[PDB]
Amino acid sequence: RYRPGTVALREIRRYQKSTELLIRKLPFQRLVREIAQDFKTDLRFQSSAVMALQEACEAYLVGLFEDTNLCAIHAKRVTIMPKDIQLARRIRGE
Amino acid sequence: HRYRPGTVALREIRRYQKSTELLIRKLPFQRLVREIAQDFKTDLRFQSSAVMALQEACEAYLVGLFEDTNLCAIHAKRVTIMPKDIQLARRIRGER
Amino acid sequence: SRKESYSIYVYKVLKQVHPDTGISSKAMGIMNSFVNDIFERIAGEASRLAHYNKRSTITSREIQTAVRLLLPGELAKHAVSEGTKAVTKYTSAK
Amino acid sequence: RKESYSIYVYKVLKQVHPDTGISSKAMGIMNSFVNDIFERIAGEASRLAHYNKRSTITSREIQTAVRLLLPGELAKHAVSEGTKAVTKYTSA
Amino acid sequence: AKAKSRSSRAGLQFPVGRVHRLLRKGHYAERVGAGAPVYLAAVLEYLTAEILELAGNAARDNKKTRIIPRHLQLAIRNDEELNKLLGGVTIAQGGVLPNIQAVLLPK
Amino acid sequence: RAKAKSRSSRAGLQFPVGRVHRLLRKGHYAERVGAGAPVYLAAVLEYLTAEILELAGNAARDNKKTRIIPRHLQLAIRNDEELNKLLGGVTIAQGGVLPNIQAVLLP
Amino acid sequence: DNIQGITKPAIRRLARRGGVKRISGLIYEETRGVLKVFLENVIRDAVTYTEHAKRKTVTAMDVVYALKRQGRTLYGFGG
Amino acid sequence: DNIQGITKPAIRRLARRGGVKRISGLIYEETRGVLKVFLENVIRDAVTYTEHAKRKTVTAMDVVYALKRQGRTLYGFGG
DNA sequence: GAGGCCGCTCAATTGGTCGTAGACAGCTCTAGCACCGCTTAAACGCACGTACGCGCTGTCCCCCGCGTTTTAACCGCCAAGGGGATTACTCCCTAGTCTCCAGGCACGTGTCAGATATATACATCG
DNA sequence: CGATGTATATATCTGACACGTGCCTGGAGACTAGGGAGTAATCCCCTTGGCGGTTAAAACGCGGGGGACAGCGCGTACGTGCGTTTAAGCGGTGCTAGAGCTGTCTACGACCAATTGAGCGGCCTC
Questions:
Q1: May I ask the CATH architecture of the domain D1-92?
Q2: Alpha-carbon span G35 to G63, nearest angstrom
Q3: Which residues, renumbered to this chain, carry the PTM N6-lactoyllysine (chains G, H)?
Q4: Rounded to 5°, angle at Cα F13 from F7 and F18
Q5: DSSP notation for G17-59
Q6: Structurally, what CATH architecture does the domain formed by C1-93 represent?
Q7: CB of D31 under 7 A from strand J?
Q8: What number does CATH give the domain E6-85?
Q9: How far is it, in rounded angstroms, from Cα E50 to Cα G15?
Q10: Is the CB atom of residue C24 positioned under 7 angstroms from any atom of strand I?
C-alpha cells in the first residue's frame, strides 16, 4: 500500500507534465447547451466553439486553485476549504 | 482616568471614516515627489495641482491595500496586520 | 480659447430632479469627467462592433448592442427603452 | 484570400534556427501575437497625437508608445532597432 | 425657415448636435448615422439623472442644500449597479463608506 | 522607369513595410501617417518575433525534439521575466503550466 | 441537470494540476457553482455577438471576443 | 532620504481609514517601500508624457493620463 | 503531418501635383520659485500595563488507497438538410457646401449658505 | 454614578455661487452626388441524428491513520498618556522662467494613374 498522499505527488507531476483536457467532452457540451437555452432556443454551436469554452474554463479553474492553495497555506492548513475560495475571489474582486 | 486598549482605536476608525481630509503632510510629500523625479529628468518644475493629484492617488491606493490586508489578517484568526498579510494581498492582487 | 463643457445641461437635469438644490463646482467637474468617460466607452465598443461585421456606418443597432454589452442588469433595460423612445419621437416628429 | 504573416514568421525562424520547423498551431499562435501587439502600439500612438493637438502620427509617437508599453530592456533594444532601421532607410 | 433645435425635437436636454459632431471627429468610423446621437444622448441623460437624483437625496439626508463630492461617493457606492459600472474609479475628496468588521467590535 | 525594389529590402527587414503602412492608414488611427512610422513598427515587430522564436527553439531542442509546439511557446513566455510581463494576461491553448510545487508541500 | 456531468474525479484532476494535495469534500459543490457563473457570463456575451450578426450559429470568434471583453485573451483559435 | 517624511502617524491614520484596529511595528518600513514603487511607476509615465510634449513643466493632465494607462482613473482634475 | 512546386492576379511601386499644418521667431503676462517672520499644531520621546500571538498536547473523524462492478464515453460509419457564404441589382441614405442667425462662452456684480466661535445638553464608557 | 466626548443650538460674517450683459462661432436649413447597404437566389459545407460495440472510466464499500481544531499557558509587544521641541503652515514681497499666442511660409503627405511580380490556393510526396 502506498502511504496517504504519496500518489498525489505523482498525480501532480503527471498533470503538470501533460497538456490534455481533463473534463469529459460530452458532459461539458450538454452543460453548455443547457445554459444557452436560457438566452435563445434553437441555437447551433460550432464544434470548435465548445473546445474554446472548455480551454478557457479549465485555465480559469486551475488559476483559481493556485490562489486557493496560497490562501490555505496562509492559514497553516494543508487542506483547501470553501472559505479559501471565497477569500481569493474576494481579493481578486469577483 | 484611563481608557482600555482599543477603544480610542475604534473612535479613530469612526472619525477617519467619517471625514474626507487628506492625511499625509503636504510639504514632506512634495519633497519626496521632487526627489523621485530628478532620477528621470533634471530641472523639472511641478504645477501645484499635479502634486495634489499624486497625493490623492497614493492615499486612495494605500487605504484599499490596508482593507485587503485586514481581510487576510482576520482569515488567519488574528486582529493584528502583519507584513505577510500585505505580501499575500499583493500576490493575489497580482502586483507581486 | 473657449472651453466647451456639459455644465449647462447637467444643471438643467438637476433642476428637474431636485428644484431646491444646487451643485458645487467640484462636483460639476466630477460629473463633467463622468460623461466624457462613458461617452468614450460606448463609442469605442460601437466602433469594434462595426469592424467585426465589416460594416462602415455606425447605427442605432451598434449603440444598442454596445449599451447591452456595457451596462449591468436593469440599467441596460431602462437605457434601451429611453433610447428607443427618443428615436421614435425624433422620427415621428419629422 | 486571407492575408497572414506566416511566411515572414517562417523566414525569421530560418534566421534563428535553420534546422527547426514549426507546426500550424504554433504558427496561428504567432499570428495572433503579432496582431495583438500591432493594435496595442497603434492605439497609444493614436492617443499621444490627440493630447498634443497633432493631426499626424510620426516616428516619435511610435517611439514613445514603445517606451510606454514594453518593459525596460525590451524597450531599450526595440528603440535601438527602430532607429537603425529608419536611418538605414532614409540615408539609402 | 425658423430654426428649431434637434434636441427639442427629440425631447432631450443634452446636445444632439454636439454629440454628432464629436462622433464624426472622434475617428470611430468613416460614417455616422442620423439616429446614433439621439440614442447616445438619451442614454447619457438617463445615467446623469440617476446619479444626480441619488446624490441629491444623500444631500437631503445630511440636511445640506448643495451637492459636494462626498454626496456623489455616497450615491455611487451604495448602489450595487452603479458601483459595478464605476468600480475602477477614484473620486477626489470622496472618502470611504463607514464599515467595521464584526470581529473587531467589543464582545 | 526605375526597377522596383521593396521598401522592406531597403530597410533590411523581413516584415512587410507596405502592408503595415496600409494597416495604419486603413485603421482610423489618425488622418495622416508619416513615412517613418511603418519602418519603425515593422522593425519592432520583427525584433519581438525573433526574441520569442529563439527561446522557443531552445525549449524544443532541450526536449530533444525538432518541431516547435504550443507547449514550447508557453515554456518560453513563462520562463522569461520580461515576456511574462508583456504577456501576463494571456492564455495559450494546449500550453499547460510550469512545473512548480510549494516547498512546504514536499516531504 | 447536466452540472452533475462535472464529476468529482474531474475536479480532482484540476486541483492536482493546480498543485493541491488534499481537498475537503465540500469543495465540489462550491466549484460547480463558481464554474456555472463563469460560463453564464461568457455565454451571455457570445450570444449577444451572435444576435447582433443575425446568425443562428455561435462561432468560435464570438467566444474569443466575449473572453477579450472580460480582459482574458485566448490564443489559438484565430484573431 | 525624504521617504522618512511619510511619518508613522500618517501611516497609522491611513490604516485607521481602512478599518485596521491593531498594527504590528514592522508595517511602516514595508509600507514606505510599497509607496515608493507606486510613485516611481506613476512618475516615470508622467515624465514620459511631459518629454513627448517638449515641456519642462509637469502638469495635472500628465498625471491623470499616467493613471489612466495604468487602470486607476481619477475624477475631478480633468477629462 | 509539413514542405516543394505550379498558375496566376491584385496589391504594391514610381512618378507628378497641390493644399496646409507644423516649424520658426517675436511677444507678453502668468505662476512657479526663493526668502522672511511668527504662531502653535503636530511630532517625538519615555513610561507602563494588559491583551494578543505563539507554541503545545490530545482526539476523533473523514480523506486517501484498493478491489469489483457497471455504465455511458468514445470510435466509426451512414443520412440528410439547415444554414453560411457568395453573387447580382439598385435605391436611399450620409457626405460636402454655402448662408445666416441665436446659443453658449467670458466678464462683472453682489448677497446668503456655509465656516466659524461659544454654549451646553445628553450619551456613553468604566 | 461620575465625567468625558460628541451633538446641537445661537450669532457672526465673507466669498462662492447665481444672475445679467455682450458677442461671435458654431449649429441649422436647403441642395446635390454616389456608393454602401438591403433584397433575392443558389450552392454545397458541416451540423445534428442514429446504430453497434468494447473497453476506459466512474461509482460503491471497506479500512485506517493523517490532519483539523479545541483548550491551555505565558511573556513581550503595542496602545494610552504626559511633556518637550521642531518645522509645518500662513501672509507677504519680489521676480523672472516659460507657458501660451501670433504671424510667416515651405516641406510634407494625400491623391491618380499605369505597370508587374509577391504571395495565395491547391496538388503531390517522404
A1: Orthogonal Bundle (1.10)
A2: 16
A3: 8, 54, 68
A4: 40
A5: HTT---B-TTHHHHHHHHHHHHHHHHHHHHHHHHHHTT-SEEP
A6: Orthogonal Bundle (1.10)
A7: no
A8: 1.10.20.10
A9: 45
A10: no
